[PDB]
Design a protein around this ligand. Structure first.
Ligand SMILES: *[C@H]1O[C@H](CO)[C@@H](O[C@@H]2O[C@H](CO)[C@@H](O[C@H]3O[C@H](CO)[C@@H](O)[C@H](O)[C@@H]3O)[C@H](O)[C@H]2NC(C)=O)[C@H](O)[C@H]1NC(C)=O
Ligand SMILES: *[C@@H]1O[C@H](CO)[C@@H](O)[C@H](O)[C@H]1NC(C)=O
Ligand SMILES: *[C@@H]1O[C@H](CO)[C@@H](O)[C@H](O)[C@H]1NC(C)=O
Lengths: 40, 125, 273
């Protein structure tokens, strides 16, 4: 399961699909709702 | 004294390990290859000729054609054009008014031959 | 050999890929800053002893990512970079750089690499002062993720007015610690001669004098090669690592091509004779 609404600010989760951390766009790994969920 | 075409107090940088490609080191509300872009701004000062910053859409909501695209490359105003930096015309589709229309505008694909269109932007009045 | 010639402003054309020289290359710089980002791409001819390489580092809120790829076919820089290529994050290193002094003021940061081949790097690039009218605009300290030419382990050269150094290591955070300053590493015992410039005025007997090598740079070295805006003949003498006396690692340092590097052990063995 993906989705960044889940907490949205834990950090990098090495066993997890999309990421919700501050560098996800760098690593090109965000959830498509990152921007929305925690960055409105 | 200065170097590279960095604008807005950009600081130039290069790297010996990479064919000395050079590029700007920009402060704060400026980005773009040359700190050319006032990523802060949301309206234009009278006329718009000196408006930089983003905004990519005309009145109808239609998105601007990029100043470096092949179609735009056929018009009078495009990014491959010497004065291009001084006119705010680059590798982006941000609104500009390099030819002193009443306001900021851009090329927009309506029909074949694309049309110049007054652009989605507010006057700071 | 023909290549794609492309300025960052994106204007392109085809060049009959220069004379003697024969690789085309693409170089990409990705400037990344919280959400937003920007990509500069350059393409052109280049000389043969260039290769595939990365370097990536954090300055404050931002990361920069250099990368340059190399092929050798009448048009092959042609086409786009290279879903998901970052399916993961790999080695963790310290990173900072001189452009915001993050390096100099110990504001170092964790940075994870984007590929399984990248190692942690500390590069030093120091210049006394002028040559053209200001000289290269390399950050003086840069550290981060990368794979640079002739890497595993280390290399360095210094002389009267320059100092360059690459640490490059495959272990976790093996690039951390205080930033080297040369005037700061031990004298190793060797003395070597030092100059830049031409064999006559630049590197003449009267202009070449000894210096005390430091750190692991404990071979005396002589390099001759051909400089950019294609002014031939450039010579350089100094203290180096054996690593430097192997391969054209001095090439990229001194913006030089087609280069011979003699080297030796006994102090002073370095003179134009
Ligand atoms: C060794 O290297 C020296 C590096 O400077 C070189 O010095 C001078 O280099 C300049 C290069 O520009 C020459 O002037 C030429 O440049 C302009 C274009 O910018 C031309 O318009 C001029 O007509 C001229 O061709 C100087 O001739 C040259 N003179 C000096 C100071 O020596 C040396 O000449 C080089 N000698 C060796 C070892 O090969
Ligand atoms: C790196 O060089 C090799 C040849 O050794 C080539 O196969 C590769 O495509 C180059 N760069 C990348 C990452 O594609
Ligand atoms: C990294 O390179 C190879 C990986 O197999 C290895 O032989 C070498 O010893 C490694 N370096 C160390 C010891 O960290």
């Amino acid at each position: 399961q993906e989705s960044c609404k889940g907490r949205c600010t834990e950090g990098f989760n090495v066993d997890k699909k999309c990421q919700c951390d501050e560098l996800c766009s760098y690593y090109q790994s965000c959830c498509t709702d990152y921007t929305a969920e925690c960055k409105p | 004294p200065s170097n590279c075409d960095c604008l807005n107090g950009g600081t130039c940088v290069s790297n010996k390990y990479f064919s000395n490609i050079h590029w700007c080191n920009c402060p704060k509300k400026f980005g773009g290859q040359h700190c050319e872009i006032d990523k802060s701004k949301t309206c234009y000062e009278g006329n718009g000729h000196f408006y930089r910053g983003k905004a990519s859409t005309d009145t109808m909501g239609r998105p601007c054609l990029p100043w470096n695209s092949a179609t735009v490359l056929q018009q009078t105003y495009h990014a491959h054009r010497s004065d291009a930096l001084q006119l705010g015309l680059g590798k982006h589709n941000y609104c500009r008014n390099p030819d002193n229309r009443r306001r900021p505008w851009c090329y927009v694909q309506v029909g074949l031959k694309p049309l110049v269109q007054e652009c989605m932007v507010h006057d700071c009045a | 050999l023909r290549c794609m010639q492309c300025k960052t402003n994106g204007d392109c054309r085809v060049e009959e890929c220069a004379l003697g020289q024969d690789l085309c290359r693409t170089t990409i710089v990705r400037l990344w800053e919280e959400g937003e980002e920007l990509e500069l791409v350059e393409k052109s001819c280049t000389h043969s002893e260039k290769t595939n390489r990365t370097l990536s580092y954090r300055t404050g809120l931002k990361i920069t990512s250099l990368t340059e790829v190399v092929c050798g076919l009448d048009l092959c820089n042609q086409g786009n970079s290279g879903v998901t290529y970052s399916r993961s994050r790999y080695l963790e290193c310290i990173s900072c750089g001189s452009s915001d002094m993050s390096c100099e003021r110990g504001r170092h940061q964790s940075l994870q690499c984007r590929s399984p081949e990248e190692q942690c790097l500390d590069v030093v690039t120091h210049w006394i002062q002028e040559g053209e009218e200001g000289r290269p605009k390399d950050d003086r300290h840069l550290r981060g993720c990368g794979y640079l030419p002739g890497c595993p382990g280390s290399n360095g050269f210094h002389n009267n007015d320059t100092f360059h150094f690459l640490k490059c290591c495959n272990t976790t955070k093996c690039n951390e610690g205080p930033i080297l300053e040369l005037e700061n590493l031990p004298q190793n015992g060797r003395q070597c001669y030092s100059c830049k410039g031409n064999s006559t005025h630049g590197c003449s007997s009267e202009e070449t004098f000894l210096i005390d090598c430091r750190g692991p740079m404990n071979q005396c070295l002589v390099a001759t090669g051909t400089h950019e805006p294609k002014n031939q003949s450039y010579m350089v003498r100094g203290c180096a690592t054996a690593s430097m006396c192997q391969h054209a690692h001095l090439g990229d340092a001194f913006s030089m091509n087609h280069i011979d590097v003699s080297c030796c052990t006994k102090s002073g063995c370095n003179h134009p004779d």
